Amino acid sequence: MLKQVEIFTDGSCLGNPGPGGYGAILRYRGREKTFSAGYTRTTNNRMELMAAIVALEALKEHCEVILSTDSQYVRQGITQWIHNWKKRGWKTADKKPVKNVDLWQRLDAALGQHQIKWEWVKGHAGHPENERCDELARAAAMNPTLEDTGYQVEV
Ligand SMILES: [Mg+2]
Ligand SMILES: [Mg+2]
> Is 148 an annotated catalytic residue?
no
Cα torsion through 33, 53, 36, 16, rounded to 10: -160
Residue 134 among the catalytic residues: yes
Contact 49, 73 (CB under 8 A): yes
CA 19 to chain CA centroid, nearest Å: 17
Integer Cα distance of 146 and 154 in angstroms: 20
Q: Are strands 3-13 and 63-69 parallel, antiparallel or unpaired?
A: parallel
> If we measure between CA atoms, which residue out of 24, 86, 90 comes closest to residue 58?
24
Evaluated on CA atoms 24, 26, 103, 120, the torsion sign reads: negative
**Cα–Cα distance, 105 to 102 (Å, whole number):** 6
This entry's atomic model was obtained through X-ray
Rounded to whole angstroms, the Cα distance separating 36 from 98 reads 26
CA distance 40 to 48: 15
Stated resolution in angstroms:
1.7
Residues marked as binding?
A: 10, 48, 70, 134
Residues with CB under 5 A from ligand 2 (ion): 10, 12, 134
32 is catalytic: no
Tell me which amino acid residue 107 is: L
Burial 70-89 (b: 16+ CB within 10 A, else e): bbebbeebbeebbeeeeeee
Q: Indicate the domain borders of the chain.
A: 1-155
